[PDB]
C-alpha cells in the first residue's frame, strides 16, 4: 500500500558531454549516485567523449524526509589502466530544488567540477523526479 513513512526518489540520466578521464583512455564509464547513503550504478558505457547511458536510480525514502540540504553527490568511476582513480568527475545535484517544486520533477545539469572547476568539463544532464508518497500510517 502507500503505509509507512512516505517518499521516494527517482534520477534517471540522459547524456554526459566531454567525459575524458586523466588515463591513456576510458576503461569503463559508469556513473555512480551516492544519494542516502546507498551507492547507485548505472550500466558501463564503452570509451567515447560522450558516453550516454540513458538510465536511472531509484532511492527509498519512506520513513525519512528530505531537506534543503539534501542533495545528491555523483561520481564517475573509471577503471585505471595502472589501480585505481580516486576521482575522476564528481557532480553534486541539489535535490532541494525538485521537492521545493509542485512539479516534483525536473532537468538538472551538473558539471563534474572540483574547487578549481575545471577538472574535466564535462556536463552529466539528469532528470530528478519526487515520489509523492502519502504514508497512511491511520
Known sequence: GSGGGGGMLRVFILYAENVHTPDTDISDAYCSAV???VKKRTKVIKNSVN???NEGFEWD???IPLDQGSELHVVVKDHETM???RFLGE??????EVLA????????NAPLLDTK???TGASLVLQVSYTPL????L
Open 91 to 96: 557532480a553534486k545535484v541539489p535535490l532541494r
Open 51 to 53: 558516453p550516454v547511458w
Open 61 to 63: 525514502l519512506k520513513g
Open 83 to 85: 589501480g585505481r582513480n
Open 35 to 37: 544519494f542516502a547513503g
Open 134 to 137: 502519502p504514508g497512511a500510517v
Open 117 to 119: 572547476k575545471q577538472p
Open 101 to 108: 517544486t509542485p512539479s516534483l520533477s525536473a532537468s538538472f
